[PDB]
Amino acid sequence: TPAFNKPKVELHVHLDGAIKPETILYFGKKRGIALPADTVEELRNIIGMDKPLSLPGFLAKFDYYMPVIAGCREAIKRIAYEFVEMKAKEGVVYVEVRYSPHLLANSKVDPMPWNQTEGDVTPDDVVDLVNQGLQEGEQAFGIKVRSILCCMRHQPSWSLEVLELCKKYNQKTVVAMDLAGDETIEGSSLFPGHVEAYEGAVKNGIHRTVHAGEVGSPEVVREAVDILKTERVGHGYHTIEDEALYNRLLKENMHFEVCPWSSYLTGAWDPKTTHAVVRFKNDKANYSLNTDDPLIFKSTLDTDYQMTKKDMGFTEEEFKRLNINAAKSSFLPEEEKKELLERLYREYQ
């Protein structure tokens, strides 16, 4: 019995972090590229985490399988189509999937990812492949699916290029720009390449979202807010350590993309302490419950909801409110956003 068997909205989930173990296996075999395990079950266990690690610790999991997906046109599109299917089955009526286009490419990328051998798959090409898959997934399963292109904290040179992709494919799936990666890199939020990209997004009406306060101090959330101009904040658990910033963001209707299970596994959340989302709930903050990387976390959307239900005390009421809030704070145009709110309100009666 799921915790909330009613329509949901997810804004914070990773394409490259939500691939099926079966599909990873398929391509490892088909391409003759190696994997840390030979069966889907053994692969699940080695790519997945059972206990809290660290942000850098969690990031090492992509090395296991990315090499097998990156560079193959049929793989990139396939995981996009299968993603939608996975969400539809979760009750998700609207989702925004994030991914770094450069990390799946094998041509026109200076630091060649995963030691790939030169190919013809351009970062731009991966954006077009993902669009097709998500769009076929929408038609095929009946849920609205949009994408978000991720700037990598350790590679600011890719940033202005991400900005262009968001411009080029504006609303043709791409709805916003993100900043993901290793938040422990002191001052990465402020690298000129990242800064320039967000400043440009503001001048061009491209929506912005930034990971901050996941593992970093509230000072990083302030960089995201003041310099980067985020509309939303990925994670943001640490914002509450700076009361003034918290209540300021609270009073500004800042949307927090919360991922309960994720925060536990990465170490972002000290389990010995009451989760930030409980304060968020009690303060009637504008937030959402997201999965982040179901693959690496061995989870589904019901994992976060149950967690917040059994522990933390979330009610059906708070789930509806929380989802309506995600709908309002989505990066969709007004017309489409209304359509969404109609769906939720219709199916919430």
Ligand X SMILES: OC[C@H]1O[C@@H](n2cnc3c2N=CNC[C@H]3O)C[C@@H]1O
Of the residues 125, 214, 302, 304, which one makes contact with ligand X according to CB under 6 A: 214
Residue 100 binds: one of ligand X, Zn ion, none (C-beta under 5 to 8 A by kind)? ligand X
| Selection from 120, 126, 123, 80 nearest residue 102 by Cα | 123
User: Could you give the residue ranges of the DSSP H alpha helices within 204-259?
Assistant: 218-226, 243-251
Interacting positions 180-199 with ligand X (CB under 6 A): 180-181
User: Could you give the residue ranges of the DSSP H alpha helices within 18-72?
Assistant: 21-31, 40-47, 55-59, 62-69
- Ranked by CB distance to ligand X, the top (closest) residue is 180
110 annotated among ligand-binding-site residues: no
Residue 16 binds: one of Zn ion, ligand X, none (C-beta under 5 to 8 A by kind)? ligand X
User: Could you give the residue ranges of the DSSP H alpha helices within 204-330?
Assistant: 218-226, 243-251, 260-266, 276-282, 294-297, 301-310, 316-328
- Ranked by CB distance to Zn ion, the top (closest) residue is 292
Task: Assess 156 for contact with ligand X (CB under 6 A).
Answer: no
16 annotated among ligand-binding-site residues: yes
Task: Assess 292 for contact with ligand X (CB under 6 A).
Answer: yes
Residue 181 binds: one of ligand X, Zn ion, none (C-beta under 5 to 8 A by kind)? ligand X
Sheet holding 174-180, edge to edge: 8-14, 92-99, 144-152, 174-180, 207-212, 232-235, 255-258, 286-289
271 exposed, middle or buried (CB, 10 Å; 0-12, 13-18, 19+)?
exposed
Point out the catalytic residue in the list 90, 161, 214, 223.
214
Residues 331, 337: contact at Cβ < 8 Å? no
Task: Assess 150 for contact with ligand X (CB under 6 A).
Answer: yes
Bridge partners, 257 (sequence order): 234, 288
- Rounded Cα gap, residues 70 and 4, in angstroms: 35
| Selection from 304, 295, 260, 262 nearest residue 47 by Cα | 295
238 annotated among ligand-binding-site residues: no
DSSP H or E run through 314: none
- Rounded Cα gap, residues 175 and 195, in angstroms: 19
Least distance (Å) from Zn ion to the CB of residue 293?
7
Residue 99 binds: one of ligand X, Zn ion, none (C-beta under 5 to 8 A by kind)? ligand X
214 is catalytic: yes
Least distance (Å) from ligand X to the CB of residue 181?
5
Mask for 275-294, x = binds Zn ion (CB under 5 A): -----------------x--
User: Quick one: 25 or 153, whose CB is closer to Zn ion?
Assistant: 153
The SS3 assignment for 293 reads coil
The SS3 assignment for 14 reads strand
292 annotated among ligand-binding-site residues: yes
How wide is the angle at C-alpha 189 spanned by C-alphas 71 and 326, nearest 5°? Answer: 80
User: Quick one: 59 or 160, whose CB is closer to ligand X?
Assistant: 59
Mask for 5-24, x = binds ligand X (CB under 6 A): ---------x-xx-------
Residues 36, 64: contact at Cβ < 8 Å? yes
Least distance (Å) from ligand X to the CB of residue 19?
11
Of the residues 4, 27, 62, 269, which one makes contact with ligand X according to CB under 6 A: 62
Q: Give the binding site for Zn ion (CB under 5 A).
A: 292
Q: Give the binding site for ligand X (CB under 6 A).
A: 14, 16-17, 55, 62, 98-100, 103, 150, 180-181, 211, 214, 292-293
Query: Would you list which residues are annotated within the binding site for Zn(2+)?
Result: 12, 14, 211, 292
Query: Would you list which residues are annotated within the binding site for substrate?
Result: 14, 16, 181, 293
Active-site residues, by number, are 214
